[PDB]
Scaffold this active site. Structure first.
Site, mmCIF file in Angstrom:
data_model
loop_
_atom_site.group_PDB
_atom_site.id
_atom_site.type_symbol
_atom_site.label_atom_id
_atom_site.label_comp_id
_atom_site.label_asym_id
_atom_site.label_seq_id
_atom_site.Cartn_x
_atom_site.Cartn_y
_atom_site.Cartn_z
ATOM 1 N N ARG A 44 30.601 -35.827 36.235
ATOM 2 C CA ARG A 44 30.790 -37.065 35.463
ATOM 3 C C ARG A 44 32.210 -36.977 34.874
ATOM 4 O O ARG A 44 32.866 -35.936 34.987
ATOM 5 C CB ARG A 44 29.727 -37.338 34.386
ATOM 6 C CG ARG A 44 28.625 -38.304 34.856
ATOM 7 C CD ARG A 44 28.184 -39.264 33.738
ATOM 8 N NE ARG A 44 29.272 -40.161 33.358
ATOM 9 C CZ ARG A 44 29.500 -40.612 32.127
ATOM 10 N NH1 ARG A 44 28.690 -40.275 31.127
ATOM 11 N NH2 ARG A 44 30.537 -41.413 31.910
ATOM 12 N N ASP A 89 26.108 -34.339 27.605
ATOM 13 C CA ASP A 89 27.562 -34.313 27.637
ATOM 14 C C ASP A 89 28.332 -33.010 27.522
ATOM 15 O O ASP A 89 29.343 -32.836 28.186
ATOM 16 C CB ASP A 89 28.074 -35.249 26.558
ATOM 17 C CG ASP A 89 27.835 -36.691 26.886
ATOM 18 O OD1 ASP A 89 28.389 -37.180 27.896
ATOM 19 O OD2 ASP A 89 27.110 -37.353 26.123
ATOM 20 N N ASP A 118 35.757 -54.030 27.103
ATOM 21 C CA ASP A 118 34.936 -52.860 26.844
ATOM 22 C C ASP A 118 33.504 -53.199 27.317
ATOM 23 O O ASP A 118 33.286 -54.255 27.928
ATOM 24 C CB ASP A 118 34.973 -52.446 25.371
ATOM 25 C CG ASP A 118 34.725 -50.951 25.176
ATOM 26 O OD1 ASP A 118 34.218 -50.280 26.094
ATOM 27 O OD2 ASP A 118 35.032 -50.425 24.093
ATOM 28 N N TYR A 134 32.900 -45.131 33.986
ATOM 29 C CA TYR A 134 34.261 -44.942 33.515
ATOM 30 C C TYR A 134 35.294 -45.410 34.545
ATOM 31 O O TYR A 134 34.999 -45.520 35.736
ATOM 32 C CB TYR A 134 34.503 -43.444 33.199
ATOM 33 C CG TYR A 134 33.939 -42.955 31.873
ATOM 34 C CD1 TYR A 134 32.960 -43.684 31.173
ATOM 35 C CD2 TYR A 134 34.442 -41.796 31.263
ATOM 36 C CE1 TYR A 134 32.508 -43.273 29.901
ATOM 37 C CE2 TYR A 134 33.996 -41.377 29.985
ATOM 38 C CZ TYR A 134 33.046 -42.129 29.318
ATOM 39 O OH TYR A 134 32.670 -41.768 28.040
HETATM 40 C C1 LIG Z 1 33.131 -35.362 24.113
HETATM 41 C C2 LIG Z 1 31.958 -36.148 24.707
HETATM 42 O O1 LIG Z 1 30.822 -35.682 24.803
HETATM 43 N N1 LIG Z 1 32.270 -37.385 25.083
HETATM 44 C C3 LIG Z 1 31.272 -38.298 25.690
HETATM 45 C C4 LIG Z 1 31.498 -39.702 25.122
HETATM 46 C C5 LIG Z 1 31.371 -39.722 23.599
HETATM 47 O O2 LIG Z 1 30.155 -39.176 23.246
HETATM 48 C C6 LIG Z 1 31.452 -41.169 23.054
HETATM 49 O O3 LIG Z 1 32.699 -41.589 23.410
HETATM 50 C C7 LIG Z 1 31.369 -41.328 21.527
HETATM 51 O O4 LIG Z 1 32.240 -40.481 20.894
HETATM 52 O O5 LIG Z 1 30.504 -40.590 25.672
HETATM 53 C C8 LIG Z 1 30.303 -40.594 27.060
HETATM 54 C C9 LIG Z 1 29.734 -41.714 27.680
HETATM 55 O O6 LIG Z 1 29.447 -41.729 28.903
HETATM 56 O O7 LIG Z 1 29.594 -42.731 26.982
HETATM 57 C C10 LIG Z 1 30.684 -39.464 27.790
HETATM 58 C C11 LIG Z 1 31.519 -38.326 27.208
HETATM 59 N N2 LIG Z 1 31.231 -37.051 27.854
HETATM 60 C C12 LIG Z 1 32.079 -36.025 27.992
HETATM 61 N N3 LIG Z 1 33.399 -36.193 27.855
HETATM 62 N N4 LIG Z 1 31.594 -34.809 28.237
HETATM 63 CA CA LIG Z 2 33.625 -50.534 21.856
#
Ligand SMILES: CC(=O)N[C@H]1[C@H]([C@H](O)[C@H](O)CO)OC(C(=O)O)=C[C@@H]1NC(=N)N
Ligand SMILES: [Ca+2]
Ligand SMILES: *[C@@H]1O[C@H](CO)[C@@H](O[C@@H]2O[C@H](CO)[C@@H](O[C@@H]3O[C@H](CO[C@H]4O[C@H](CO)[C@@H](O)[C@H](O)[C@@H]4O)[C@@H](O)[C@H](O[C@H]4O[C@H](CO)[C@@H](O)[C@H](O)[C@@H]4O[C@H]4O[C@H](CO)[C@@H](O)[C@H](O)[C@@H]4O[C@H]4O[C@H](CO)[C@@H](O)[C@H](O)[C@@H]4O)[C@@H]3O)[C@H](O)[C@H]2NC(C)=O)[C@H](O)[C@H]1NC(C)=O
Ligand SMILES: *[C@@H]1O[C@H](CO)[C@@H](O[C@@H]2O[C@H](CO)[C@@H](O[C@@H]3O[C@H](CO[C@H]4O[C@H](CO)[C@@H](O)[C@H](O)[C@@H]4O)[C@@H](O)[C@H](O[C@H]4O[C@H](CO)[C@@H](O)[C@H](O)[C@@H]4O[C@H]4O[C@H](CO)[C@@H](O)[C@H](O)[C@@H]4O[C@H]4O[C@H](CO)[C@@H](O)[C@H](O)[C@@H]4O)[C@@H]3O)[C@H](O)[C@H]2NC(C)=O)[C@H](O)[C@H]1NC(C)=O
Ligand SMILES: *[C@@H]1O[C@H](CO)[C@@H](O[C@@H]2O[C@H](CO)[C@@H](O[C@@H]3O[C@H](CO[C@H]4O[C@H](CO)[C@@H](O)[C@H](O)[C@@H]4O)[C@@H](O)[C@H](O[C@H]4O[C@H](CO)[C@@H](O)[C@H](O)[C@@H]4O[C@H]4O[C@H](CO)[C@@H](O)[C@H](O)[C@@H]4O[C@H]4O[C@H](CO)[C@@H](O)[C@H](O)[C@@H]4O)[C@@H]3O)[C@H](O)[C@H]2NC(C)=O)[C@H](O)[C@H]1NC(C)=O
Ligand SMILES: *[C@@H]1O[C@H](CO)[C@@H](O[C@@H]2O[C@H](CO)[C@@H](O[C@@H]3O[C@H](CO[C@H]4O[C@H](CO)[C@@H](O)[C@H](O)[C@@H]4O)[C@@H](O)[C@H](O[C@H]4O[C@H](CO)[C@@H](O)[C@H](O)[C@@H]4O[C@H]4O[C@H](CO)[C@@H](O)[C@H](O)[C@@H]4O[C@H]4O[C@H](CO)[C@@H](O)[C@H](O)[C@@H]4O)[C@@H]3O)[C@H](O)[C@H]2NC(C)=O)[C@H](O)[C@H]1NC(C)=O
Ligand SMILES: *[C@@H]1O[C@H](CO)[C@@H](O[C@@H]2O[C@H](CO)[C@@H](O)[C@H](O)[C@H]2NC(C)=O)[C@H](O)[C@H]1NC(C)=O
Ligand SMILES: *[C@@H]1O[C@H](CO)[C@@H](O[C@@H]2O[C@H](CO)[C@@H](O)[C@H](O)[C@H]2NC(C)=O)[C@H](O)[C@H]1NC(C)=O
Ligand SMILES: CC(=O)N[C@H]1[C@H]([C@H](O)[C@H](O)CO)OC(C(=O)O)=C[C@@H]1NC(=N)N
Ligand SMILES: CC(=O)N[C@H]1[C@H]([C@H](O)[C@H](O)CO)OC(C(=O)O)=C[C@@H]1NC(=N)N
Ligand SMILES: CC(=O)N[C@H]1[C@H]([C@H](O)[C@H](O)CO)OC(C(=O)O)=C[C@@H]1NC(=N)N
Ligand SMILES: [Ca+2]
Ligand SMILES: [Ca+2]
Ligand SMILES: [Ca+2]
Ligand SMILES: [Ca+2]
Lengths: 388, 388, 388, 388
Positions: A37, A70, A244, A324
């Site tokens: 992801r 995540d 968004d 994304y």
């Molecule tokens: C650091 C982290 O866990 N970031 C999350 C992100 C985040 O939780 C939201 O933006 C709110 O802060 O959400 C999402 C998501 O798919 O919405 C994936 C990201 N996953 C990863 N980057 N691992």
């Molecule tokens: Ca937003």
């Protein structure tokens, strides 16, 4: 050789052509493909590659159960050849962590991975495949970064990080790195009220980042960086064409310096190319979920609060899962201009398709054409039923 | 280094020796081999590789169901080491699409992939592994190209495309590319009434293409290109030894400027080497289906309407499945002449073997010998029963 | 760079140390390992690799059924990194065929593969990874060659071929190749009455080949080649320590110019290092089957008809399956002498282990040490029961 | 280029950041990962790689049954890209054997593998991927070496070997190699009473090795080598913070020249960085088993018999399996100091998890940071239940 300098302006974007597609989920139904992801694409002077955060397990492997999560100690930034799937055997680990960015400065590449528990994360900056610098969490609340490539100019590669709340004001910082070392960092300034997951590109010595206001904005915050002066500004895309997700329906007038309201504490990494009349916005078709994907030409979107679409192209049908999306360009291509490119993450599995216990994705990517090309839609292509 | 120039004439073809064979279907019964079709072979100055259009799934994978279909968003041109099978792990994606061509000009390679819906396809020309040019469909009816390597001379690499009907007159174009850019394009001229899937080779500054008249001809259309003047002519192979499939039985006199009648709207990609007495024709043994494969020496086939075989070699038994076939040569080999080579696609699965739900193939390829070598037959080798 | 010249003599062989072992059958029980037989080892100036004749299927694949057979259209000479197993993904095809040889001349490598039906086989000589020369069968009865590396001196690489009966006099030829081209060929001369599968090595501008007399001899024929004069001689190893298999019990006096009788029409590829007192013979321990393997120091074996062992080393226990064995050396190593090396093919499956329907092998290889090292036995290591 | 010289001192260690993690057992649950143990990490001037002793079988393969055993003919030292798992397809065999060491001297790499039965083992020293030297067992009782990287200075790479009893005095030797050749060897001297599995690092022309006293000591023996004079000394870490396992509870005063008593005939490979106040000790958290892992800053541990911790970092929770650990550094990194690094072997399977019949591991590795970074724990991550 020498550090790359953003000397060219963008090519005129009259349409988008197919660049890469790995069909990871399809192929992975019967081969050793890693669950991932948060993918992206990034070029070196001699090769362009797919990047993503592995979950440290194959899709068919029993450990795929639970990958909707995540951040775990089993994730890592990996890269693999353009349009191939991320397999156990062809994936190169850049660094260990659950949030990353990476970019080539012309001489070598810098990769950044953040790992840790929520209240004690840290980022480690790698350069020329070696760890050089480490930065400890400053707000003790999920230090996180771009999830797409950074951009460099004469050795200086700015990176946007956020530490703190996802649903209230946070501490966003812009770090200017050179050879993996910190030259300077600033706090976020401007009118953007919250920043997460910036998608950046560079042209004519300026770096533009289209990020996401997870807290309140359905319009996207934009950070423009001067990598020589090492300074920046921030605002929102003025346009009524909201990008968004989730988001309210498009109004007839947007907002230039405040989040456009209607949806709180949620959003998706996204991007845009802001270049006067040569402006194109990407967005999910659905206003409710990560479904579908389209490119809309919205002349002067950044500065015109009533700007609406003049042309468009469907990338993924609203009846297909998206996710994304981000920007990248091949700064080492021939020609007189930089060709805008982007990728769309095609999420499969949880939470939308819960008959399976995993969450992963495949990648589709396009680049601009000065021709007015016919359009096709590009879905992930996998049949969830096969995985049951 | 420097652009390659077609300075040599063909070696004398007294027989054909085994060049490469990947046994893809056999091996793929228990390993991660991609489902493909429309394969070919093409050389770089330092390596020769197998090429084909992947279906974005393994043979054993559940997504193999349905691969009899020709154009989907999951196909891509891939290349892999000579005689290895096309696996998930060793296949390099050249570009995304469902019809392609590729060739090295001596300095670097140009690859072309066409993708799209039937009424809105587009071709994107890649050079040195980067997208450089895009061409939109001009007849809005399945823009399509060679399905085998193109040939270059002093940087100029001509390519034949067809857009329009498969069962009536269409719009065939010859594009002259140099470094991925369009130098010039012509409409088809000459007496060929329909053109699809040209198989080309070059010798002494001339490029010969043996294509297929899907509409009416059982004899093959031939396009001869002058890559310096960037002009061409077209006609049919005069010979009574008919080489398309399906086809009527061989007459005693063929046709030089009109399709030889008897079979409409169908055919198979094929090829030939037209070099006076050093002329060899390839064809399926069966006149009804893609079954068997043989090479026949038919002196002056191109210009003699009563020319019949003087020597021959069986490549695949009529009791074995064949398919597409095409030409390629290693223009960077030592010696004083170019050694004629060709490949035969060995199709397995649908529609002929419908006990399985997939369609794929393996490749067998030969090159000429000035010796008079003993012959062997080279079947795919897989047992469909094992896949049930 | 420059052609290699056999300027060094052999190092003193006081024992044998472990060089490489791939455990192919063990690993292949649960991974994509190709079924092979007739393996060998061969060095390039910068790397040493394992070689073998693939059967065009994995061991676990259903097509493994029937691989006891020697010659099919699905075999090919493949090479892969030292001590790795021959997998679908790491095996490099050198050429297509069912009998081969290969060697590096210092500049580039020559590989030879023979394919065909029994009465119409042909050899194609590849050089620098391109086909250069082809030789048609001259006796129309299974044209066959070494099954181990050839050796080169100043560009000249001699190769021994046999065409004709396996149980009566045949037509053996020595071809002297340079850059894949034939410089000269001789008929076999000397007192050797039948030759097959020569194992060769070079030292001080002389090439020694220990082959096999399949027709009548239990002692091994030896061909010594002068690659400058491009001439040779032939005889048998005089020693009473018989090294073919099957074979009679060792006598007290051997034969220098005639096959030692007792066993007809059968044998196994084997080898030896004939260097006066620095002479070592390899052989199966069993006199009845390809079981066990030992190295015996038999001073002056080649010329002394009563020579018996003075030292020895067990390579494989008589309770373990062995098979073919051959010589190779790294002619590009540092130091003042060439270090003698050899490999033993560890055959598993049919005909000895018929509970499985396949036949394959793994490889074990050793090189000499001037130390007097302790010995270990090196079996294949796989449990056939697991494959049931 | 030129031989590397230990010209830098250690960087200040204020914390440890994540360097590499391969999640081998997790991924291997559904992909071709080799069963291993005794891993380590080692750098070349252009790349850092993971190393380990393969068991010659995949984890899911039936031959995984029995891999708790230490020495078989199916083991080999293999290396593979940093943070990838050791797969059948990406693992490079360095040499054959069941105990090893390896290191790059700046020009090329030396690798050492010992194989044999208990009473007749031998070591073969490879340099530039060729066998150069062999050493026969001198005590006829399991000749064994480091199980982690050696270190070089101006071409001289010292290596510690032990031959003899594991529960009584043995014959430990320090060999000084240069280009794979023996320059000199010494018997162990100093106050260390037993030595096995030394973990070494170099700084300012001195090589420090923290080994293990399997016979009586719960404190670790330390060997300091002068690679120019080719001499050494030995003692124990004076500190009361005991670092072997199993071990008694920490006293308030340790021992400088004798093993600290309480536990006999057992232990685990471990390491330390002894640099005055910049001293850090690694150890399992459990005093009874290979469980958990922590780093403790114990200023002057080597020389202060009452030294206790002043800072610390948890690497693996006591509720997770650990195992061997060792030192390595990237001596070819930029900057003014060498950054201390180490790896921890995360053992899974037998003997602790006996529901499965195999024993393997994954690797986690860290390097120092001058920052005071937040900590995370890094477990293997696999669920044994999935393998049942
Ligand atoms: C650091 C982290 O866990 N970031 C999350 C992100 C985040 O939780 C939201 O933006 C709110 O802060 O959400 C999402 C998501 O798919 O919405 C994936 C990201 N996953 C990863 N980057 N691992
Ligand atoms: Ca937003
Ligand atoms: C072969 O290929 C070619 C090349 O691709 C094909 O031609 C293309 O066809 C496309 C589809 O028609 C076309 O895309 C559209 O362009 C429109 C702009 O052009 C028109 O207006 C301009 C400006 O006046 C004129 O100059 C021009 O001549 C045209 O008339 C866009 O407006 C279109 O996007 C809008 O519609 C789509 C649905 O079709 C939405 O998904 C999209 O979001 C846009 O509409 C929403 O947003 C606007 C802005 O706020 C709202 O006003 C509107 O109500 C919609 O809002 C709802 O939906 C959104 C999204 O769900 C939601 O968030 C919001 O709240 C509301 O609920 C579209 O982009 C290409 O430009 C055209 N390309 C070319 C070169 O011609 C050709 O058809 C193909 N041939 C065949 C045979 O198929
Ligand atoms: C070891 O190896 C060597 C080397 O390969 C073997 O020797 C080779 O043997 C081959 C088989 O005999 C041979 O191939 C044939 O060559 C013929 C030409 O040579 C003969 O004629 C010339 C000219 O006068 C003489 O100079 C020469 O001496 C010979 O006598 C070809 O004519 C043969 O092809 C035709 O037959 C095959 C069936 O065998 C067809 O499949 C093929 O299509 C040809 O026949 C069709 O087409 C012609 C032309 O229109 C029609 O007239 C004819 O009726 C057939 O038409 C029907 O079939 C087609 C196809 O299905 C259909 O479309 C049509 O409508 C009709 O229904 C053949 O090519 C090699 O030349 C020869 N090589 C050498 C170097 O000698 C040797 O045997 C091997 N040794 C052993 C022990 O096996
Ligand atoms: C640690 O490692 C070291 C290093 O390896 C170990 O030491 C080694 O030990 C080996 C085994 O003892 C030894 O190998 C033997 O060497 C003998 C030669 O040395 C002896 O004679 C010389 C000459 O007079 C003396 O100078 C010397 O001091 C010794 O006394 C060989 O003769 C041995 O081979 C023969 O026996 C083996 C069975 O052991 C057979 O398999 C082999 O084929 C030889 O015997 C057959 O062949 C001869 C010749 O025709 C016949 O006369 C004889 O009857 C046998 O014939 C039958 O069997 C064959 C084969 O099946 C069949 O075809 C035929 O028809 C008959 O049926 C053997 O090679 C190493 O040299 C020695 N190395 C060193 C450096 O010392 C040490 O033991 C290890 N330590 C521990 C604790 O294990
Ligand atoms: C975010 O991240 C940061 C950065 O990591 C976190 O801050 C870190 O927190 C760590 C945990 O608190 C801390 O680690 C400890 O450091 C202690 C030393 O510091 C303290 O003392 C000094 C010296 O006076 C003071 O200057 C300083 O201010 C502190 O007060 C160590 O002593 C700790 O180790 C000991 O405890 C752990 C259990 O916690 C044991 O596992 C470990 O073995 C040590 O204790 C054993 O050994 C000693 C020595 O013999 C014995 O005396 C003691 O009784 C224990 O012995 C038993 O256990 C062992 C092992 O099982 C056994 O063998 C023996 O027989 C006995 O049974 C510990 O290392 C970091 O230094 C600190 N880092 C920083 C930069 O601040 C922060 O918490 C995180 N934030 C959040 C929100 O989580
Ligand atoms: C193929 O032909 C062209 C000539 O048309 C050769 O091109 C010349 O090459 C030399 C060396 O690169 C230059 O100095 C000339 O100006 C080049 N081009 C032209 C168009 O005049 C080319 O070298 C030939 N290729 C090879 C391999 O010999
Ligand atoms: C092997 O021997 C030949 C001499 O027979 C060497 O060849 C000479 O090499 C030099 C440098 O390449 C040339 O100037 C001579 O003309 C070469 N050949 C002949 C046939 O005279 C060759 O260099 C030797 N190989 C090596 C590695 O030393
Ligand atoms: C563009 C496309 O789909 N081309 C088809 C081709 C074509 O349909 C016929 O020539 C008639 O026009 O037929 C066949 C065929 O096997 O007959 C395969 C090609 N498959 C692919 N190239 N994907
Ligand atoms: C060309 C060929 O098939 N050679 C055979 C060889 C041969 O049959 C005998 O030597 C008698 O001539 O026997 C054996 C054998 O294991 O005994 C394997 C070889 N297999 C292969 N090289 N494919
Ligand atoms: C040479 C050998 O077998 N060494 C053993 C080692 C050894 O048995 C003890 O240190 C006592 O001497 O123990 C262990 C162990 O995990 O404790 C693993 C090693 N495994 C391997 N290196 N293969
Ligand atoms: Ca036709
Ligand atoms: Ca015999
Ligand atoms: Ca598998
Ligand atoms: Ca101990």
């Amino acid at each position: 050789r020498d550090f790359n300098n953003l000397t060219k302006g963008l090519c005129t974007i009259n349409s988008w052509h197919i660049y890469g597609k790995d069909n990871a989920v399809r192929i992975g139904e019967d081969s050793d493909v890693l669950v991932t992801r948060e993918p992206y694409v990034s070029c070196d002077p001699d090769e362009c590659r797919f990047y993503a955060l592995s979950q440290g397990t194959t899709i068919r492997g029993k450990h795929s159960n639970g990958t909707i999560h995540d951040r775990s100690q089993y994730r890592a930034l990996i890269s693999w050849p353009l349009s191939s799937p991320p397999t156990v055997y062809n994936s190169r680990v850049e660094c260990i962590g659950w949030s990353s960015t990476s970019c080539h400065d012309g001489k070598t590449r810098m990769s950044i991975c953040i790992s840790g528990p929520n209240n004690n994360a840290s980022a480690v900056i790698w350069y020329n495949r070696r760890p050089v610098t480490e930065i400890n969490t400053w707000a003790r609340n999920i230090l996180r970064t771009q999830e797409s490539e950074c951009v460099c100019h004469n050795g200086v590669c700015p990176v946007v990080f956020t530490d703190g709340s996802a649903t209230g004001p946070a501490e966003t910082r812009i770090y200017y790195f050179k050879e993996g070392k910190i030259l300077k960092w600033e706090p976020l300034a401007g009118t953007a009220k919250h920043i997460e997951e910036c998608s950046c590109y560079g042209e004519r010595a300026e770096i533009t980042c289209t990020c996401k206001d997870n807290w309140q904005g359905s319009n996207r915050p934009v950070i423009r960086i001067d990598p020589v002066a090492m300074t920046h500004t921030s605002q929102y895309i003025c346009s009524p064409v909201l990008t968004d997700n989730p988001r309210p329906n498009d109004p007839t007038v947007g907002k230039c310096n405040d989040p456009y309201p209607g949806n709180n504490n949620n959003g998706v990494k996204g991007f845009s190319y802001l270049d006067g009349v040569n402006t194109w916005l990407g967005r999910t078709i659905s206003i409710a979920s990560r479904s579908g994907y389209e490119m809309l030409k919205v002349p002067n979107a950044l500065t015109d609060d009533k700007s609406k679409p003049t042309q468009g192209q469907t990338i993924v049908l609203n009846t297909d899962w998206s996710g994304y999306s981000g920007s990248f360009m091949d700064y080492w291509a021939e020609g007189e201009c930089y060709r805008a490119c982007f990728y769309v993450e095609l999420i499969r599995g949880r939470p939308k398709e819960d008959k399976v216990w995993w969450t992963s994705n495949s990648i589709v990517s396009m680049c601009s054409s000065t021709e007015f090309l016919g359009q096709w839609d590009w879905p992930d292509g996998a049949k969830i039923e096969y995985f049951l």
